[PDB]
Ligand binder design. Structure first.
Ligand code: CL
Lengths: 267, 102
């Protein structure tokens, strides 16, 4: 229907429905084919996924990540449903080339976790038009996902888009705090970094990842780390105003504080 | 056996062929000259062989709950990746569309 003030595997428990945006009504219409939006209703296994993905998407937009039009609608059972505008559909019924990193590296749905962040860098170097520019946001995207507890960034959640004959990392999609959504969360990262999926430290992100693997200079890293420092106040304000329940909000803030303390954000 | 047209943004690009045993082969049409079906398949080569279902075409299939929704809508086996691809080929994530030849 219509939106409201929102203008191993984990994702395989939530529906991904196609929908068109009605011209006059402004409401959504779920269709089987030829849709321009993706609708994600509530999951009967993990709680508050639409409200989780909605606020996490807005947090990514605050730190400067390319985020498409997203929001929340009211389902027919009066529950909240998340929607996102597809960036592989661009009006006049035209399409854009979109390929995920499992297709680009020879993997499939069953082995979408059998990779590494170092292989993710290799794909970007091989196919992107400006690999140096893409490494800057891959650093920002990986830092963001670690801070908001997104531990489901497998190969199918990274995608390359071809827009105006320029090949770059697609806008953000499938970004949510998946750590608070489950119990007994096993990993902090979906793909290992420096052979590590848990207990990752500041030197793993800012030294091995940012300097040795991505080739960013110190002033670029310091500017991005400073960017995350000034966004913590606004991040806590947006979460408190989100549509998450108070119990889900407290789990979000506690996990955000824990990851910030690990990266020495408060000292 | 089973063959399927592979189009890019409406324009027919090539043919994906189920081959004997378990192999698969994609062949670009000589006329085609736009954008590649996949970045792993540049136009400089016209023929691509695979020992399994190619990973690009496997990446267009549904996943998780949406795969169970497909398997209860169609009379198709859960491991028939080529058959499932033909059922959804009219609309997938990329600019690529598949239509069966038979
Ligand atoms: Cl560059």
């Amino acid at each position: 229907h219509c939106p409201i003030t929102y203008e191993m595997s984990v994702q395989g428990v939530q529906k991904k429905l196609s929908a068109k945006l009605k011209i006059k009504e402004g409401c959504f219409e779920i269709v089987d084919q030829y849709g321009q939006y993706i609708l994600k209703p509530q999951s009967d296994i993990y709680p508050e996924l639409p409200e989780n993905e909605a606020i996490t998407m807005t947090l990514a937009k605050t730190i400067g990540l390319e985020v498409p039009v997203h929001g929340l609608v009211y389902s027919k059972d009066n529950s909240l449903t998340y929607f996102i505008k597809r960036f592989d559909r661009i009006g006049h019924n035209k399409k854009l080339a979109l390929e995920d990193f499992a297709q680009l590296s020879g993997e499939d749905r069953h082995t979408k976790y059998k990779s590494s962040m170092e292989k993710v860098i290799a794909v970007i170097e091989q196919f992107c038009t400006f690999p140096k520019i893409e490494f800057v946001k891959l650093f920002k995207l990986t830092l963001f996902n670690f801070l908001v507890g997104n531990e489901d960034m497998h190969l199918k959640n990274f995608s390359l888009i071809t827009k105006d004959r320029k090949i770059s990392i697609s806008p953000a999609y499938d970004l949510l705090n998946s750590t608070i959504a489950q119990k007994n969360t096993k990993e902090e990262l979906a793909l290992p970094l420096k052979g590590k999926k848990n207990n990752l430290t500041k030197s793993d992100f800012l030294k091995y990842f940012a300097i040795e693997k991505l080739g960013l200079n110190q002033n670029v890293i310091d500017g991005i780390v400073q960017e995350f420092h000034q966004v913590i106040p606004k991040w806590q304000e947006l979460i408190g105003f989100s549509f998450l329940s108070q119990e889900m909000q407290e789990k979000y803030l506690e996990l955000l504080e824990q990851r910030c303390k690990r990266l020495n954000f408060f000292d | 056996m089973r063959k399927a047209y592979v189009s890019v943004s409406g324009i027919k690009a090539g043919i994906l062929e189920e081959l004997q045993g378990g192999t698969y082969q994609f062949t670009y049409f000589e006329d085609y000259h736009g954008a590649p079906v996949s970045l792993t398949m540049p136009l400089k080569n016209k023929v691509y062989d695979f020992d399994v279902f190619p990973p690009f075409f496997e990446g267009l299939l549904p996943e998780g709950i949406m795969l169970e929704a497909l398997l209860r809508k169609y009379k198709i086996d859960k491991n028939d990746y080529f058959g499932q691809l033909i059922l959804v080929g009219q609309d997938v994530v990329g600019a690529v569309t598949i239509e069966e030849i038979r």
